[PDB]
Amino acid sequence: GIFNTRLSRTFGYTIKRTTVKTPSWAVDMMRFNINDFLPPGGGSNPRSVPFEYYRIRKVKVEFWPCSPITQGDRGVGSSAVILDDNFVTKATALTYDPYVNYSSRHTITQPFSYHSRYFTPKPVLDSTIDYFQPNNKRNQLWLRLQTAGNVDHVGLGTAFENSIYDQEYNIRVTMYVQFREFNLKDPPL
Amino acid sequence: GIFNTRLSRTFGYTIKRTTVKTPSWAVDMMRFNINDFLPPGGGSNPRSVPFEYYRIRKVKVEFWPCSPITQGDRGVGSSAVILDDNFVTKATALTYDPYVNYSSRHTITQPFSYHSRYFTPKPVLDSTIDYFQPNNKRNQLWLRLQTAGNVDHVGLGTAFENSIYDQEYNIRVTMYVQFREFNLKDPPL
Amino acid sequence: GIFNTRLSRTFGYTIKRTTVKTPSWAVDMMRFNINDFLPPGGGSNPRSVPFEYYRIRKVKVEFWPCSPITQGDRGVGSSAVILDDNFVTKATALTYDPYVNYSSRHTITQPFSYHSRYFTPKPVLDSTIDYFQPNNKRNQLWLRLQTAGNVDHVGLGTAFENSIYDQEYNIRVTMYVQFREFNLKDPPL
Amino acid sequence: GIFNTRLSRTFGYTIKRTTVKTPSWAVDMMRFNINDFLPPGGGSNPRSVPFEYYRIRKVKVEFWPCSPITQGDRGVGSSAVILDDNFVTKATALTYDPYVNYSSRHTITQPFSYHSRYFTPKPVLDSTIDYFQPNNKRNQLWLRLQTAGNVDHVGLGTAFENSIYDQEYNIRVTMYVQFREFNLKDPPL
Amino acid sequence: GIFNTRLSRTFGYTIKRTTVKTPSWAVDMMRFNINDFLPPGGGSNPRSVPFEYYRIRKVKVEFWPCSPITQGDRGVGSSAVILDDNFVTKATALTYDPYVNYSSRHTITQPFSYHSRYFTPKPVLDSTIDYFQPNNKRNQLWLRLQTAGNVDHVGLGTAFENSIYDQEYNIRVTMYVQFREFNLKDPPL
Amino acid sequence: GIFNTRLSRTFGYTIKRTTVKTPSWAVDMMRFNINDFLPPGGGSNPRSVPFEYYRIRKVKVEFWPCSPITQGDRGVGSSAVILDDNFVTKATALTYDPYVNYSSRHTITQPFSYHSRYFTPKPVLDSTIDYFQPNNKRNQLWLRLQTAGNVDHVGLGTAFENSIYDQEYNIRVTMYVQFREFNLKDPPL
């Protein structure tokens, strides 16, 4: 019983100002979990979408700027796809862009420019070995939609060039999911 | 955002015994409401299936017998489709089968025989005028999936021939519904 | 060195009687392990089928009734396929059929009727995450035929409607397996 | 329930030196029994390979030398197929080669050379009359896989020229058999 | 960013002499890890090949002899492919060749003969369950190239026939690997 | 063993303000060396990319502005390709644009506009004679990837029109290189 749908979530991210003169970059990570998109249900149905299995097909991360088009001290960054839960260490002012030479690098124009990334994440099945599957719609694993313990999906790391002014963003993540085995429970009343 | 699915519900019906010698029939009615198939949800989602609109396409009423194949004093009844909320009055021992000459009559062999009826019900929009639409999949009205006040659908009346022994049935109603406008709400936690 | 064969096993299951008047259902689970079908061998060959690897292709669960065709208080249940080791909790008299709205539900006529289910099970590789593969004969994983510690395969849950009389069944499970790498050891004597 | 496969075994054979000056040969036969290749099983299953029947298709005898290539006093011998269990008498130093003129003769270089024979053996049904069937894959008989009383098959005899030095070989046998009637037995535990 | 290359490594293996008269075999195992082929890098690049992911496609194990062609007491052994990290126990003088009846057995002529094996290994993801994938170039898992903790690949076990003389070998393992996601880091200087 | 890849590097360039009223231009040069893109390696591998030879195919110089789009006193400059290590002399306020009549001149809109140049540089083999090859992918010379003494490539000179305000730029040079003869060294540990 397949049901392809779309789930979204919005949150903020700010790159604080720095008095440093050099071009330094601010590094951070981004994971994706389905608990943040799918709330708990009620009653005999533990989740709000009554299905048993799921598998995330795609994610769309949108960096919607919060800064005016008149803001100066512009910069240039990079967003890369990291499917293994080993990101570059979080840094406030690093002397280089680590994600620049990555094959999945897209340039981030800053601060007042929109940046989208559309990709297929991978689940963290074993963080010790960090193995994942290649892209195959027919062979992608089905995970279970747990009650409160779903596994973290992974796949984006960023590097933003710091500035004299604060750079704020409203980040909207949209997960395109595919469920299976409609499992609604209908007790009497 | 269409989603065709199937919702079921099971309940009992008994035709009590009678010392009456004549062939008399027991008349009863059967309505269909979506509250009995779709429970209330939890949180910002008032219902368990997160959709706004619905329209019932078909219903399958199944009279599953509870009586052995050795039971005697067998009989013959009738099930008809009544799309207007004006049934023959409920009777315990009526001297005739009212639903026998109906164009939608199917014979009910009793007591140990299975009886199915598959039809398209109609909603009770105005009980004073009792108007309904003909069968058209493209023009069928969309109703709203209310929180606790959905409208009764209608479409089956029965007449069972009484017997010296009690005739029990387990009635399984299956509604084939079609929803629209996925409206999940995802607050933070 | 492929060898497709067929292994069987027979055991009993009883749904005890209940004085409860309502229609209640008895829920239970069913796992499959190869130790119950393949005994230990003798000598340098730890198992009786001299192969290294295996993978279960299909299972046929047959509910052979033990009850006469004259038994009354008949009922209606459901059997569903559960490939993840999270079954509905075992219950004696539950007020509803949980497996009724499952996409893999087959109706169980009770008590004197035969019920078969033919499906492809999945192994329990990680019970915490509960991941499994879709059906693909060419890509199905090969497991090792361990000596005394093989992994449990999963895939059936049932719901039987209770009755005044005891409902007994003789359940015959047949696993269609596929072995690899003939590994017979022939020491002197 | 057919199952073609391959079984093997290894043992040693030596040809002690002789002070005789004339060209003399040493004679010896070779039988083939399955009990040497197939150990006993365990439990209800008397044999490790669970089938009832078998019938040998082919045998591959391999004379692997143990000697160096620098060894002198080279010689020459013969092998032949004998399907009756009435061989030439075993001899140490015979003045001629009995197996030379047989139609199934293949020459044997000595001492450091590889030699192989690939043929269809035959069983010993009646040692008095010593009869068998011509080669036919469809009309070959099916024998029973006994517990500790399988029959001896036959089909090779040899003749090796003696020397001043000891000639040692490692003999590997390989059987190509074909079983039938999978007969596994699964008692409880 | 795919880069198929070839990595090699050379080491020794000796089968010590034995006064035992019988034909006995020496059993040993062989695993493959990428730390032994890929050294640690320097600086911000933890490894010498600047890539993130890898997957081993093939391995070529070459037994290059160290013994002269005049060496006697020759023998015959077996090499088999064991993709699950459960080898036959290491033995000095075992009374039989365990790997002889394996479907992946290749004969090892000893002592002065070259033996190659070319196969696709499998990683040890769970040693408790010992599951692996079949051969599929498109679906083979990508592992992470860890810094100092890579997972052991597996796939060869041997059985060498003992001798009066020591049998030495220089074993050259060549792994054909496939990397992904070039991740060079270029800080200033 | 060819491996085409891409190496990047980012640095700053500022055109300081001038009180001069006339239109004057600021002249500067730009060379390219592989030491600034490829760091030193570690151990027996002197460089981080384990190859022997290289040849630079293309370079992409990107002038990413640092100035707001509201900045006035705009100007117009020129970027030319100079493949011989004899640039126009560096000047702070020159009374004309020297690179304007060059056949390889591209106009630089200033200050808030992006300027890219994509070309094939040439190495400085003899600065006395200053000879170089025409563009030919098949005949381009292979240089050696030295340890700390690589030769400077050349090919861009600029002329920026001065302004009352400071004009800052973040210059990102990307070299598209082609290596040869994978030369990894793997000592023991």
Ligand SMILES: O=C(O)[C@@H]1O[C@@H](O[C@H]2[C@H](O)[C@@H](NS(=O)(=O)O)[C@@H](O)O[C@@H]2COS(=O)(=O)O)[C@H](OS(=O)(=O)O)[C@@H](O)[C@@H]1O[C@H]1O[C@H](COS(=O)(=O)O)[C@@H](O[C@@H]2O[C@@H](C(=O)O)[C@@H](O[C@H]3O[C@H](COS(=O)(=O)O)[C@@H](O)[C@H](O)[C@H]3NS(=O)(=O)O)[C@H](O)[C@H]2OS(=O)(=O)O)[C@H](O)[C@H]1NS(=O)(=O)O
């Ligand atoms: O010994 C000979 O007579 C002679 O042997 C060979 O010549 C060599 C000399 O023997 C050797 N000296 S020795 O020390 O005596 O060995 C040296 O002198 O060199 C010579 C030159 O030959 S060589 O260069 O080849 O060595 C030669 O035979 S051969 O070498 O095998 O070719 C022959 O010249 C001759 O042997 C033949 O005759 C004997 C004696 O019988 S007779 O000739 O008929 O009188 C044959 O013996 C047969 O087989 C045995 C047996 O298999 O045991 C007997 O069979 C019966 O018993 C079995 C059961 O066994 S038991 O439980 O009784 O032990 C029953 O199941 C059978 O049914 C019985 N036979 S039946 O009912 O009559 O059919 C019996 O003695 C005899 O039976 S029969 O003849 O088969 O019927 C011998 O096989 C035969 N040689 S063969 O080539 O045919 O094998």
